[PDB]
Amino acid sequence: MQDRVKRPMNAFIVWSRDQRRKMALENPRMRNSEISKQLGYQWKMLTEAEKWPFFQEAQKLQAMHREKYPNYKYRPRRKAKMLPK
DNA sequence: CCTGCACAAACACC
DNA sequence: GGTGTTTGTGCAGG
């Protein structure tokens, strides 16, 4: 059995993990589909200085993630797509 | 050099 | 389980 390595969480995913739970406790009956929309609206209102602390952490998680798997490569699966010429 | 696709995590609903 | 939603990252094509 092989365990697959998941991609490092980006500043928004890390910031949503803790913010998403905050909104769920205050809005435990709101569906993630709507919360995901308000978080994106609120996330776009944060300043770069306020977002910086979350970007640096994602950057640290990415470097630390790279230390665990220094040979890891992002290899997305392509779907059957052929554009006309 | 520029543009677009595929994929990361968490949760209510059917 | 799959559905339905956010933002940000890295690779491939022309």
CB A15 within 8 A of CB A43: yes
Residue A43 Cβ under 7 A from any strand C atom? yes
Residue A43 sits at the vertex; the CA angle it makes with A41 and A45, to the nearest 5 degrees, is 80
Could you give the count of Cα atoms lying within 13 Å of A80 in the half-sphere of its Cβ?
Answer: 0
Is A37 strand, coil or helix? helix
- Set out the domains of chain A in order of their start, with CATH numbers: 1-85 (1.10.30.10)
Q: Which residue is nearest to nucleotide C4 (CA to C1')?
A: A33
Q: A69 is written with which tokens?
A: 């798997």
- What kind of experiment solved this structure? NMR
